[PDB]
A and B are shown apart, each in its own frame.
With several copies, the nearest count.
Chain A
Amino acid sequence: YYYHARVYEFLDKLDVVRSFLHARLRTATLRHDADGQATLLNLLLRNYLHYSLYDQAEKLVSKSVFPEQANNNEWARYLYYTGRIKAIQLEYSEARRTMTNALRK
């Protein structure tokens, strides 16, 4: 998946390819594979921000629970996007946090 999205360009990839990532995102979520979940989540977040939609991604986070056992790089990818959208919405003081972690992790 990390490559799949990557090369991709537009709708059929942002939209048609996104519907899949959310699909098995749910599937794997019930399958309890931490790594693949977190990765996929990151990919669709990155999609929202290749788009202009912060809100959709924000309320997306609102219904999200992130898992444990991770790869610190993916962990910082998350904390990065998180901090960012968290910032654009004006709330700074919690953005510094997630970005600081994006430096640590």
Chain B
Amino acid sequence: EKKQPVDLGLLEEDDEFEEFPAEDWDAHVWEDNWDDDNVEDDFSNQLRAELEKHGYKME
């Protein structure tokens, strides 16, 4: 059955990136997920919240 699966996989592809991924092949997961997104915002905001208000100080 495993062999059959493998065969199927082979047919579907090879593959280029898939091979690389396999080669690379860890870690955990923690608990739950979504949505990460970007970062360096909060302080950036404050950096701007200053600047903003500093601009508003400039105002």
Q: What is A's interface to B at a CB cutoff of 8 Å?
A: 2, 6, 46, 71-74, 76-77, 80
Cβ of B19 under 8 Å from chain A: no
Tell me the chain B residues, 23-44 only, with Cβ under 8 Å from chain A. Answer: none
Q: Is the interface of B mostly helix, strand, loop or mixed?
A: helix
Give the contact-size bracket for chain B: under 10
B11/A76 in contact, CB under 8 A? no
A73/B12 in contact, CB under 8 A? no
Contact among A6, A73, A80 for B4, CB-based, below 8 A: A73
Cβ of B8 under 8 Å from chain A: yes
Given contacts A73-B5, A73-B7, 13 further A-B contacts (CB under 8 A): A2-B7, A2-B11, A71-B1, A72-B1, A73-B1, A73-B4, A73-B8, A74-B8, A76-B8, A77-B8, A77-B11, A77-B12, A80-B12
- Chain B residues lying within 8 Å of A76, measured Cβ to Cβ, are 8
Whole-angstrom distance between the Cβ of B14 and the nearest chain A Cβ: 11
